[PDB]
Amino acid sequence: MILDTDYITENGKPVIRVFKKENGEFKIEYDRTFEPYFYALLKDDSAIEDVKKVTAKRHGTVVKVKRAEKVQKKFLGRPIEVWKLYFNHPQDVPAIRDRIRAHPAVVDIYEYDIPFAKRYLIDKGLIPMEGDEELTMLAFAIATLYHEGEEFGTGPILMISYADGSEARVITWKKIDLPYVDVVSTEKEMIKRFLRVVREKDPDVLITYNGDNFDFAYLKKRCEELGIKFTLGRDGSEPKIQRMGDRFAVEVKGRIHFDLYPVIRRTINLPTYTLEAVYEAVFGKPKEKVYAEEIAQAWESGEGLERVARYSMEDAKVTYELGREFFPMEAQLSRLIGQSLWDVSRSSTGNLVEWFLLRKAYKRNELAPNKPDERELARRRGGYAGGYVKEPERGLWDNIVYLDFRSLYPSIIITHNVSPDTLNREGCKEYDVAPEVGHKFCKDFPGFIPSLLGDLLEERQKIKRKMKATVDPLEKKLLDYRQRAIKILANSFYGYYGYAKARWYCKECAESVTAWGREYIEMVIRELEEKFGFKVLYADTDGLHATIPGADAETVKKKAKEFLKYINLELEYEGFYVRGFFVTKKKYAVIDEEGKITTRGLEIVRRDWSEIAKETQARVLEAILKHGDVEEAVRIVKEVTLVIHEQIATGPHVAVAKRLAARGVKIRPGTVISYIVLKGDRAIPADEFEYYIENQVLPAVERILKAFGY
């Protein structure tokens, strides 16, 4: 099973390494035969010999074209002849890149920004995670000592906990009598012990929960200080930092760093994404939280470390569980997309599609379109994110059912051959035309995307069947993940078409799918109401919320079931809510059987919500959704009518910075500040102690109860 790839330089030349785990033993395959390249479309075939004379300089040395050959490919279905330019080193590309394009005899260049190691996987048709090989995993966490105004990584690490399917221990340098705690001499020795623990277990996967932005970075600093070499890599190398625009991402050569945050962030949707919230909102068990403060005072007092050690133990244990849960899915996805799970698990749906397409484009000799440049990206004025919207039915409704119709869109792309290479193609014998928008989509030939899209659904349907007709409990679970993976990819093409950075961007395609979509949604709504007497309260691009007024759960459910069998592209019943209410087009809140409330656009977006404004809301919305008591929630506001734990030149802001600075606290990035407001005198640090109504508790519950008539 292939886990990943990368390249190493040796005598100036690139050497690909393929990290695999076969029959229980880890291995590295090397390849010195792969040559990097990119394409050049000459505006004149005669100017080739000269274009190969262009050079650039890298590491003081001069780089030039190693070799150029003419090839025949198709750009958007139509024949094109381009020059495949070879080089000696992957790094040559970004150097000479722009200068070759700028050459007077060159129209444009393509496939010049595809990472060598990814390019290798594609051009070689290698698929990561191809089988059923058992992979070992180890989750790890750390507890550190922190004090306000402390530059990052300044304080030491108090404990390093780790866990796997067999145990969950804690490594610390202070005496603690727990059977799982392990006391050592110093911090340095504790870190050394960890690297030693990791080295003996030698896990294929290291699971963390935000290790991409905290854990690894911290250990790095401490290691830089205590003078240690953090050699977690299976090749003795240290963790490597990769910055991905927004945040950073850390890799550990030879192993898979599975950071559960980017994943759970997507896969699940909550109000708070803290480890406690996540574990609870998944396993339904509670997790006790021990804050930095207590940690410090407990360490600097030798009083109560049994608790912190428990929390550290739990962090690692709880991380291993979540990782064992979300890993099988991510592995199937990565296999479908054909890229490393390290990459896949960190990618957006728009990018999962793009990688799938790139691989397929290669298989079909389809030259790929470039990402949008600065200019072109400006033209797209943001892409297209329009969709079908309604106008909710006011009031608090019961036993709501949720119809998901994201499965519609892919059928529509296949059905009308919606693709950028079929749109308004001249000289076709047959065309389908988008209602209201009028984009024409040729049908004489199957388009690139529609064509792939069809294949996926075929594949998925094949699996679902092989899955129901199987005695192998393992295979069943396995196939279930793959079918669920295909669904994810399939349902991302619609959005991808309007995603502004997309190479195969197609606002028209997107607009047309939206048009045809409206039609269909219109028809099923009608059928729902008339033939089934259902009440549709809310509908948007993803699905609708509806109930049979005055009926019960058992029936509204029963009834909704048959409607699907009747009306069925498949429509999935994805949700039942004991209560709910919709304020407008995108604003609303629902509660389910287990009680897990949910909301959307119910208040203004800000990061300075006071503890009261927050606690008041949850109480208002809990009386309504959990008790259908409006007067209740309203009498809760009246009487309720204290800190602001803002995360990181406003009235309070400036005032707070002075007060902190006044005692040496520097406001550092990515930290939380806690103040109280009381109109450089507006606010005051929490520790040392009207607006709070008309700019706090009111705005938090203003929309909610406006919808109920107040």
| Three-point CA angle 469, 472, 475, nearest 5° | 90
Please report where in the chains the tokens 């690490």 appear, as a residue.
Answer: 157
Helix (H, G, I), strand (E, B) or coil at 6: strand
Q: Give the C-alpha distances (Å, rounded to integers) separating 306 from 98, 144, 234, 345.
A: 60, 15, 34, 35
Strand 157-163 and strand 137-144: the pairing is antiparallel
CA 447 to chain centre: 29
* Backbone dihedral angles phi then psi of residue 177, each to the nearest 5 degrees: -100, 85
271: amino acid identity, one letter: P
Q: Shortest CA distance to 36 belongs to which of 96, 76, 82, 79? A: 96
Contacts of 318 (CB under 8 A, 6+ apart): 275, 279, 287
Q: Shortest CA distance to 464 belongs to which of 447, 444, 478, 448? A: 478
Strand 137-144 and strand 205-208: the pairing is parallel
Buried b or exposed e, range 560-569, using 16+ CB within 10 angstroms? beebeeeeee
Asked if 137 and 204 count as a contact pair (C-beta separation under 8 A), the reply is yes
State this model's resolution in angstroms.
2.1
672: amino acid identity, one letter: V
Residue 345 has what DSSP assignment? T
Q: Give the C-alpha distances (Å, rounded to integers) separating 136 from 6, 68, 256, 364.
A: 21, 45, 10, 37
Cα gap 348→705, rounded to integer Å:
36
Cα gap 285→282, rounded to integer Å:
8
Cα gap 81→122, rounded to integer Å:
21
286: amino acid identity, one letter: P
What fold is seen in the domain 1-130+348-368?
A: DNA Polymerase; Chain A, domain 1 (3.30.342)
Q: Which two tokens stand for residue 643?
A: 């800190």
* Backbone dihedral angles phi then psi of residue 196, each to the nearest 5 degrees: -75, -40
CA 189 to chain centre: 36
* Backbone dihedral angles phi then psi of residue 364, each to the nearest 5 degrees: -105, 25
CATH superfamily name and code, 369-446+500-578: B family DNA polymerase, palm domain (3.90.1600.10)
Asked if 174 and 302 count as a contact pair (C-beta separation under 8 A), the reply is yes
Q: Give the C-alpha distances (Å, rounded to integers) separating 635 from 582, 612, 617, 630.
A: 21, 15, 12, 8
Q: Give the C-alpha distances (Å, rounded to integers) separating 129 from 251, 321, 336.
A: 17, 21, 9
Burial class (CB in 10 A: 0-12, 13-18, 19+), 11: exposed
Where is 624: in which H helix or E strand? helix 611-627
* Rounded-to-10 torsion of CA 172, 177, 178, 180: 40
Q: Give the C-alpha distances (Å, rounded to integers) separating 230 from 3, 75, 118, 191.
A: 22, 47, 27, 9
Helix 448-468, helix 408-415: angle, nearest 10:
130
Asked if 392 and 400 count as a contact pair (C-beta separation under 8 A), the reply is no
Cα gap 210→265, rounded to integer Å:
11
Cα gap 345→338, rounded to integer Å:
12
Residue 102 has what DSSP assignment? T
Cα gap 192→194, rounded to integer Å:
5
Cα gap 490→145, rounded to integer Å:
46
Asked if 147 and 155 count as a contact pair (C-beta separation under 8 A), the reply is yes
The sign one gets for the Cα dihedral 111, 113, 116, 121 is negative
Please report where in the chains the tokens 């504790």 appear, as a residue.
Answer: 190
CA 574 to chain centre: 21
Q: Shortest CA distance to 275 belongs to which of 327, 324, 249, 311? A: 311
Contacts of 33 (CB under 8 A, 6+ apart): none
Alpha-carbon Rg for the chain, nearest whole angstrom, is 29
Q: Please provide the DSSP assignment of 563-583 as one string.
A: HHHHH----EEEEEEEEEEEE
Residue 647 has what DSSP assignment? B
Asked if 709 and 637 count as a contact pair (C-beta separation under 8 A), the reply is no
Report the 10 Å Cβ neighbour count for 13.
Answer: 12
Cα gap 579→538, rounded to integer Å:
13
Buried b or exposed e, range 521-545, using 16+ CB within 10 angstroms? beebbeebeeebebbbbbbebebbb
Q: Which two tokens stand for residue 292?
A: 């930095």
User: Which residues on neighbouring strands pair with residue 63, listed in sequence order?
Assistant: 56
Q: Shortest CA distance to 362 belongs to which of 87, 124, 6, 86? A: 124
Contacts of 307 (CB under 8 A, 6+ apart): 290, 294, 298
* Backbone dihedral angles phi then psi of residue 90, each to the nearest 5 degrees: -45, -35
Q: Shortest CA distance to 108 belongs to which of 90, 91, 83? A: 83
Helix (H, G, I), strand (E, B) or coil at 688: coil
Q: Which two tokens stand for residue 348?
A: 């957006």
Where is 441: in which H helix or E strand? strand 440-442
Report the 10 Å Cβ neighbour count for 509.
Answer: 31
Q: Shortest CA distance to 331 belongs to which of 118, 477, 114, 168? A: 477
Helix (H, G, I), strand (E, B) or coil at 641: coil
Cα gap 572→580, rounded to integer Å:
20
Asked if 607 and 647 count as a contact pair (C-beta separation under 8 A), the reply is yes
Helix (H, G, I), strand (E, B) or coil at 35: coil
3-state secondary structure 452-515: HHHHHHHHHHHHHHHHHCCCCHHHHHHHHHHHHHHHHHHCCHHHHHHCCCCCCCCHHHHHHHHH
CATH superfamily name and code, 447-499: B family DNA polymerase, finger domain (1.10.287.690)
Burial class (CB in 10 A: 0-12, 13-18, 19+), 166: exposed
The sign one gets for the Cα dihedral 86, 87, 89, 91 is negative
Asked if 282 and 268 count as a contact pair (C-beta separation under 8 A), the reply is yes
Report the 10 Å Cβ neighbour count for 192.
Answer: 18
Strand 181-183 and strand 168-172: the pairing is parallel
Helix (H, G, I), strand (E, B) or coil at 97: helix
Asked if 197 and 167 count as a contact pair (C-beta separation under 8 A), the reply is no
Q: What share of residues in the chain are helix, strand, coil (percent, to 5)?
A: 40, 25, 40
* Backbone dihedral angles phi then psi of residue 70, each to the nearest 5 degrees: -85, 135
Cα gap 261→275, rounded to integer Å:
9
Q: Which two tokens stand for residue 599?
A: 């909301």
Q: Give the C-alpha distances (Å, rounded to integers) separating 23 from 17, 156, 521.
A: 19, 40, 50
Q: Please provide the DSSP assignment of 363-419 as one string.
A: HTTBPPPPPP-HHHHHHTTT------B-----S-EEEEEEEE-SSHHHHHHHHTT-S
Where is 325: in which H helix or E strand? helix 305-337
Cα gap 1→214, rounded to integer Å:
30
Contacts of 229 (CB under 8 A, 6+ apart): 223, 238
Cα gap 350→383, rounded to integer Å:
12
Cα gap 137→325, rounded to integer Å:
12
Q: Which two tokens stand for residue 584?
A: 């407008």
Please report where in the chains the tokens 């002075």 appear, as a residue.
Answer: 658
Helix (H, G, I), strand (E, B) or coil at 682: coil
285: amino acid identity, one letter: K
Q: Which experimental technique did the depositors report for determining this structure?
A: X-ray
Buried b or exposed e, range 264-292, using 16+ CB within 10 angstroms? beeeeeeeebebbbbbebbeeeebeebee
Which CATH class, in words, describes the domain spanning 131-347? alpha beta
Domain ranges of the chain: 1-130+348-368, 131-347, 369-446+500-578, 447-499, 579-710
CA 405 to chain centre: 22
Q: Which two tokens stand for residue 115?
A: 């990472």
Question: How long a stretch of residues is the chain?
Answer: 710
Asked if 657 and 623 count as a contact pair (C-beta separation under 8 A), the reply is no
Asked if 579 and 590 count as a contact pair (C-beta separation under 8 A), the reply is yes
Cα gap 314→161, rounded to integer Å:
8
User: Which residues on neighbouring strands pair with residue 707, listed in sequence order?
Assistant: none
Helix (H, G, I), strand (E, B) or coil at 132: coil
The sign one gets for the Cα dihedral 577, 581, 582, 586 is negative
Q: Which two tokens stand for residue 225?
A: 């200080």
Cα gap 317→168, rounded to integer Å:
6
